[PDB]
């Protein structure tokens, strides 16, 4: 995470339609918008008091979690704001009356509010197509 020195891109990074007005003065100088994703997932403390933007964040972005909820082990985190998780399952071959191991890679967008490492068991929620191949969003980290 390391707060990614937020104001780095060419275009100014801000939360859409979240206006701070300079005429008045009060606490919470920069207003922050967030939401609870539902299904019992909690809004992590970092998202509330962070400084990132990540307009694809399921708590402070314009994306919504709906559909399947999955779980897997993070296997590659060399992307930027994205990780690939491995979902293993046993596929039952009817003829031989027994199972065979299988796996899939599900590239999921990881919010800056989360910190993940190789081997972390994470749960993801479905959302509208984020990129060419990203359709899930990291919503709860279960291991460190």
């Amino acid at each position: 995470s390391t707060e990614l020195t937020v104001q780095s891109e060419r275009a100014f990074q801000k939360q859409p339609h979240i206006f701070n007005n300079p005429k008045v003065k009060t606490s919470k100088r920069t207003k922050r918008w967030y939401k609870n994703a539902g299904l019992g997932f909690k809004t992590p403390k970092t998202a509330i008091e962070g400084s990132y933007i990540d307009k694809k964040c399921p708590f402070t972005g314009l994306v919504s979690i709906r559909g399947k909820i999955l779980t897997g082990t993070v296997v590659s985190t060399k992307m930027h704001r994205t990780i690939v998780i491995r979902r293993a399952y046993l596929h039952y071959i009817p003829k031989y009356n027994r199972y065979e191991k299988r796996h899939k890679n599900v590239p999921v967008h990881v919010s800056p509010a989360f910190r993940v490492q190789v081997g972390d068991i994470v749960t993801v929620g479905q959302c509208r197509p984020i990129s060419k191949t990203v359709r899930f969003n990291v919503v709860k980290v279960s291991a460190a």
């Binding site: 104001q7 100014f12 801000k14 701070n20 300079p22 920069t30």
Partner: peptide
């Protein structure tokens, strides 16, 4: 442009 956004550009 005002405030933080103005000082950014």
């Amino acid at each position: 442009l005002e405030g933080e956004e103005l000082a950014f550009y």
